[PDB]
Coordinates of all heavy atoms in Angstrom, one line a residue:
Chain A
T20 N 11.7 -5.8 -13.7 CA 12.1 -7.1 -13.2 C 11.5 -7.3 -11.8 O 12.2 -6.9 -10.8 CB 13.6 -7.3 -13.3 OG1 14.2 -6.3 -12.4 CG2 14.1 -7.1 -14.7
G21 N 10.3 -7.7 -11.7 CA 9.7 -7.8 -10.4 C 10.4 -8.9 -9.5 O 11.0 -9.8 -10.0
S22 N 10.3 -8.7 -8.2 CA 10.9 -9.6 -7.3 C 9.9 -10.5 -6.7 O 8.7 -10.1 -6.5 CB 11.6 -8.8 -6.1 OG 12.4 -7.8 -6.7
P23 N 10.2 -11.7 -6.3 CA 9.3 -12.6 -5.6 C 8.8 -12.0 -4.3 O 9.5 -11.3 -3.6 CB 10.1 -13.9 -5.3 CG 11.4 -13.8 -6.0 CD 11.5 -12.4 -6.6
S24 N 7.5 -12.2 -4.0 CA 6.9 -11.6 -2.8 C 7.4 -12.2 -1.5 O 7.3 -13.4 -1.3 CB 5.4 -11.8 -2.9 OG 5.1 -13.2 -2.8
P25 N 8.1 -11.4 -0.7 CA 8.4 -11.9 0.6 C 7.3 -11.8 1.6 O 7.1 -12.7 2.5 CB 9.6 -11.0 1.1 CG 9.3 -9.7 0.4 CD 8.5 -10.0 -0.9
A26 N 6.5 -10.8 1.5 CA 5.3 -10.6 2.4 C 4.2 -11.5 2.1 O 3.8 -12.3 2.9 CB 4.9 -9.1 2.3
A27 N 3.6 -11.4 0.9 CA 2.5 -12.3 0.5 C 2.9 -13.8 0.6 O 2.2 -14.6 1.3 CB 2.0 -12.0 -0.9
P28 N 4.0 -14.2 0.0 CA 4.5 -15.6 0.2 C 5.4 -15.8 1.4 O 6.4 -15.0 1.5 CB 5.2 -16.0 -1.1
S29 N 5.1 -16.7 2.3 CA 6.0 -16.9 3.4 C 7.3 -17.5 3.0 O 8.4 -17.1 3.4 CB 5.3 -17.9 4.4
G30 N 7.3 -18.4 2.0 CA 8.5 -18.9 1.4 C 8.5 -18.7 -0.1 O 8.0 -17.7 -0.6
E31 N 9.1 -19.7 -0.8 CA 9.2 -19.6 -2.3 C 8.2 -20.6 -2.9 O 8.2 -21.8 -2.5 CB 10.6 -20.0 -2.7
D32 N 7.4 -20.1 -3.8 CA 6.4 -21.0 -4.5 C 7.1 -22.0 -5.3 O 8.1 -21.8 -6.0 CB 5.5 -20.1 -5.4
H33 N 6.6 -23.3 -5.2 CA 7.1 -24.4 -5.9 C 6.2 -24.9 -6.9 O 4.9 -24.8 -6.8 CB 7.5 -25.5 -4.9
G34 N 6.7 -25.5 -8.0 CA 5.9 -26.0 -9.1 C 5.6 -27.5 -8.9 O 4.9 -27.9 -8.0
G35 N 6.2 -28.3 -9.8 CA 5.9 -29.8 -9.8 C 6.4 -30.4 -8.4 O 7.4 -30.0 -7.9
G36 N 5.6 -31.3 -8.0 CA 5.9 -32.0 -6.7 C 6.3 -33.5 -7.0 O 5.6 -34.2 -7.7
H37 N 7.5 -33.9 -6.4 CA 8.0 -35.2 -6.6 C 8.9 -35.6 -5.5 O 9.4 -34.7 -4.7 CB 8.7 -35.4 -8.0
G38 N 9.1 -36.9 -5.3 CA 10.0 -37.3 -4.2 C 11.4 -36.7 -4.4 O 12.0 -36.2 -3.4
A39 N 12.0 -36.8 -5.6 CA 13.2 -36.1 -5.9 C 14.3 -36.5 -4.9 O 14.8 -35.7 -4.1 CB 13.1 -34.6 -5.9
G40 N 14.7 -37.8 -4.9 CA 15.7 -38.3 -4.0 C 17.1 -38.0 -4.5 O 18.0 -38.8 -4.6
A41 N 17.3 -36.7 -4.8 CA 18.6 -36.2 -5.2 C 18.7 -34.7 -4.8 O 17.9 -34.3 -3.9 CB 18.7 -36.4 -6.7

Side-chain angles (χ1 to χ4, degrees), chain A residues 20-28 30 34-36 38-41:
Chain A
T20 62
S22 307
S24 66

